[PDB]
Amino acid sequence: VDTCSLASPASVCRTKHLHLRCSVDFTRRTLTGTAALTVQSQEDNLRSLVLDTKDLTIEKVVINGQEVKYALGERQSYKGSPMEISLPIALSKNQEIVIEISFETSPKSSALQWLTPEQTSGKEHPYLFSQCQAIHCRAILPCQDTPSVKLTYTAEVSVPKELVALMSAIRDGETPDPEDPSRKIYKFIQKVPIPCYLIALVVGALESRQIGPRTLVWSEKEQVEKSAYEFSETESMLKIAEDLGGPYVWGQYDLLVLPPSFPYGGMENPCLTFVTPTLLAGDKSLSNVIAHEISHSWTGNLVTNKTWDHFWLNEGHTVYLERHICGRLFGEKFRHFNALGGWGELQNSVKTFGETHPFTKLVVDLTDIDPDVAYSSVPYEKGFALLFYLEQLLGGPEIFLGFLKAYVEKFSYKSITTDDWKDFLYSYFKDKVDVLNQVDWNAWLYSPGLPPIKPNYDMTLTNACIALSQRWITAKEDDLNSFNATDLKDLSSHQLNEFLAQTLQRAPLPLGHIKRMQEVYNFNAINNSEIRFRWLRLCIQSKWEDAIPLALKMATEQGRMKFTRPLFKDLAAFDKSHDQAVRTYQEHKASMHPVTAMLVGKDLKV
Ligand SMILES: COc1cc(O)cc(CCc2ccccc2O)c1
Ligand SMILES: [Yb+3]
């Protein structure tokens, strides 16, 4: 049973399709419209069902052309309020009805950010966007808000005519509003059954330019040139992901580069991946995020996790594919380098939570836990680590990729659990059941802390990062003169970032070493968001006052949670800046993405 959802479970009824016809109102910061759900019954004699809702105003519910009775339950925190609909005629098993619910969103909807014009690049027009992973789709519309249910949908969206609307679906045409000539209706069809966390909307002044045979890049006009350059290897990545995954079943693959308040690096919305504009490093150095979003097209969007207790199935197989893409493009030694960094970030998450803390288990139990609160790098890296370990044990990359394609093939258009994964892994590796029983499964799946085994890693590109970091850390004042900008000359931006990751793991350092590091490396000049973030974290943790305004400036001007939350956290901890960090949050709380705003307020103990 899906514990994070209050709707009737899939064992009762199943949404097959959603028709949504809505209207984006920027004066009220609301979406208003109707959600017509086509619901099949799974039982005999079905007379009622519950849907998920959150801060939605419900005007009425119409089945068979007539208003039916319904009741809203009391709010249950982050879960929202259940919405029971009294059905007018009892359904037999497999009977299908259409429920059309007239609704309105609240401006406080946790799934949406309402951007004023000054918060955009252009400064003339407003912007709005959505993030429904994990359980915020109920903040947009009543639904069975669980990934245990997949549905197709269609939409018609009325927006200011000067604006443009996109969704996670095939764009199905645009027309002016028959009822209101100042507006446009844009239409969307999604023919592939999807879980509702992938429903996506963005409304703004968008421009497009084509970067491949199935890719257009979407953003504000100021951002299109840079976006088209930065993501020009997407077709190449797709061809690899198809060769490893099997056919791409979604048709198009467009990329939308969002404003900086977007809280994730990416979101794998079918046909329209959302990406952070912090990926625009000028050099395609952060292209692995695109490889993560492309990979989700199979592992995530096709093979879906039945519940959020099994999210690792989403992220771990995806991180496994993403590094496989990156491995093709740039070499097997590069895959291992990324893999090893991954274990590095897993070390930090376990250090941060504590090695016995429940969110460090691969499979979590999310009863009474906001998924926004549990979100970490753990499910990505522990999932990846498990799959890497399994690769090595079971005969290396070629064989484990055979398992991975069969896995997509085997579970496409379904929502699975960990036993469904492990059972199939066992059916596939019939001849290696002895190898598999050797694996310690309770530990990998259900024990907290680090995995019980570490897989073998090639060290070739990593050894240079570890060397320079150790040189800095074992340096005493009288060695600091020997550091020089030629220390970095054979370092890729990636090894550089790994050098800072290595160093940050041992923070703090003497103020003097940091001062010197700036002096000869000019890290401050670097605009790569990964490098800068770690360099800034290193400076604040090492107590450098000069870095307060920079780290502050990064924490607010962008809003990617991977960077924003540790920056406010480090700053809260540093005595000299603690009070500016709290006051800066409170100055910008209103203007922040609601989930980011929530997590930073808790992080800051406001
Ligand atoms: C951005 O997508 C998510 C949003 C959330 O609020 C929560 C999640 C996943 C929650 C989760 C699942 C499994 C293991 C750890 C974990 O944090 C994902
Ligand atoms: Yb010395």
Residue numbers in the entry: 4 to 609
Please quote the paper that reports this structure.
Leukotriene A4 hydrolase (LTA4H) is an enzyme that classically functions as an epoxide hydrolase to generate leukotriene B4 (LTB4) from leukotriene A4 (LTA4)12. Recently, we identified a secondary anti-inflammatory activity for LTA4H whereby it functions as an aminopeptidases to degrade the tripeptide Pro-Gly-Pro (PGP). The interface of these domains forms an L-shaped cavity where the active site of the enzyme is located.
We hypothesized that whilst conventional LTA4H inhibitors would occupy both sites it would be preferable to develop molecules to bind to one of the two overlapping binding sites (Site A) present in LTA4H, leaving Site B free to bind PGP. This should block detrimental hydrolase activity, whilst preserving beneficial peptidase function. The origins of the augmented capacity of compound 9 to inhibit LTA4H epoxide hydrolase activity were explored by modelling and X-ray crystallography. The X-ray structure of LTA4H shows high similarity to literature examples (RMSD between 606 atom pairs is 0.204 Å). Whilst 2H-resveratrol forms two interactions with Trp-311, one H-bond and one π-stack, these are absent in the compound 9 structure, where the 3-methoxy-5-phenol ring rotates to allow the phenol to H-bond to Asp-375. Importantly, previous site-directed mutational interrogation of the active site of the enzyme has identified Asp-375 to be the only residue uniquely and absolutely required for the enzyme’s epoxide hydrolase activity. Thus compound 9 represented a chemical series with clear and rational potential to selectively inhibit the epoxide hydrolase activity of LTA4H. Compound 9 exhibited sub-μM capacity to inhibit LTB4 generation in a cell based assay, whilst showing no inhibition of PGP degradation at 100 μM – thus exhibiting a superior selectivity to ARM1 in our hands. Whilst compound 9 exhibited a targeted potency and selectivity, preliminary studies suggest that it does not possess a suitable drug profile, being readily metabolized within microsomes.
